[PDB]
Design a protein around this ligand. Structure first.
Ligand SMILES: [Zn+2]
Ligand SMILES: [Zn+2]
Ligand SMILES: [Zn+2]
Ligand SMILES: [Zn+2]
Length: 112
DNA sequence: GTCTGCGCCGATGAGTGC
DNA sequence: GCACTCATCGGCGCAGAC
């Protein structure tokens, strides 16, 4: 609907195209008031700002370890739930971590 | 050299509400 | 139609264990 003049990717609205163009201009409008690091995406600055607060607000319901970000907590909880979301494309094996799945698939390929 | 665990990013998407 | 918030998910880097 809204196409990028520089790489042909397409977007839904003026605002999402405007956001994508920052990948090409390097514009980073949103500046951390503590350390001065700038971000292209306001939501990414907000994650960063949690680091300076030092409040690890996201707590594991299984072992009670605390984390700075919700996403970091959720990745951690996979250890407890047994969620293995990375599937080998060649066999039944399932993996907790993407890097491990990738190395396992490469072993299939080296065998042909 | 690989597996684990995790800290911190870029960039896109879903949901929401105007 | 539109923008905003937060989720999502890959990438990367690293340290400890083996
Ligand atoms: Zn582009
Ligand atoms: Zn900062
Ligand atoms: Zn836990
Ligand atoms: Zn396999």
């Amino acid at each position: 609907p809204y196409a990028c003049e520089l790489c042909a990717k397409q977007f839904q609205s003026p605002s999402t195209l405007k956001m994508h163009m920052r990948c090409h201009t390097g514009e980073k409008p949103y500046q951390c008031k503590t350390c001065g690091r700038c971000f292209s995406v306001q939501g990414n600055l907000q994650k960063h700002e949690r680091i300076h607060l030092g409040l690890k607000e996201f707590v594991c319901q299984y072992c009670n370890k605390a984390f700075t970000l919700n996403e970091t907590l959720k990745i951690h909880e996979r250890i407890h739930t047994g969620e293995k979301r990375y599937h080998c494309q060649f066999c039944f094996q399932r993996f907790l971590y993407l890097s491990t799945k990738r190395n396992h698939e490469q072993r299939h390929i080296r065998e042909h």
